[PDB]
Amino acid sequence: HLLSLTRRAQKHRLRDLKNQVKTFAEKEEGGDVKSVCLTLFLLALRAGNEHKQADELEAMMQGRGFGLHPAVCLAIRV
DNA sequence: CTGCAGGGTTTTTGTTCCAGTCTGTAGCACTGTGTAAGACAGGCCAGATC
């Protein structure tokens, strides 16, 4: 399983999906790498759905921190 | 059937370099913990004594 090999190892696998995402970025967004993968993965995880990850996947990017936000780290240091 | 050599096969695993972008340690000049009375030699004076 690819989860056991190195990250360098994976070179051969995802060529076609990189081509597809580069072609898709042009016609609808213009270069938005984040969203096209985020809304795909967060929703595909909920295909066979346990909410244990739905919490982990929701706060991952925007709110808040992930990990603790930099301002919270600054306050807990000062 | 087996044995081993050596053919191809995919898939690591890493192969060269230049824009970068990010991370982690090096260089700078300097800190703070070292924290008290006692020994000794000389000058002298005051009270005792003949």
UniProtKB/Swiss-Prot annotation:
It comes from the Eukaryota. Residues 1-62 bind DNA. In the adult, predominantly expressed in the thymus with lower levels in the pronephros, mesonephros and ovary. It is found in: Nucleus. Belongs to the RAG1 family. The RING-type zinc finger mediates the E3 ubiquitin-protein ligase activity. Catalytic component of the RAG complex, a multiprotein complex that mediates the DNA cleavage phase during V(D)J recombination. V(D)J recombination assembles a diverse repertoire of immunoglobulin and T-cell receptor genes in developing B and T lymphocytes through rearrangement of different V (variable), in some cases D (diversity), and J (joining) gene segments. In the RAG complex, RAG1 mediates the DNA-binding to the conserved recombination signal sequences (RSS) and catalyzes the DNA cleavage activities by introducing a double-strand break between the RSS and the adjacent coding segment. Homodimer. Component of the RAG complex composed of core components rag1 and rag2. This is V(D)J recombination-activating protein 1. The lineage of its organism: Eukaryota, Metazoa, Chordata, Craniata, Vertebrata. The chain holds residues 414 to 491 of 1057 of the full protein.
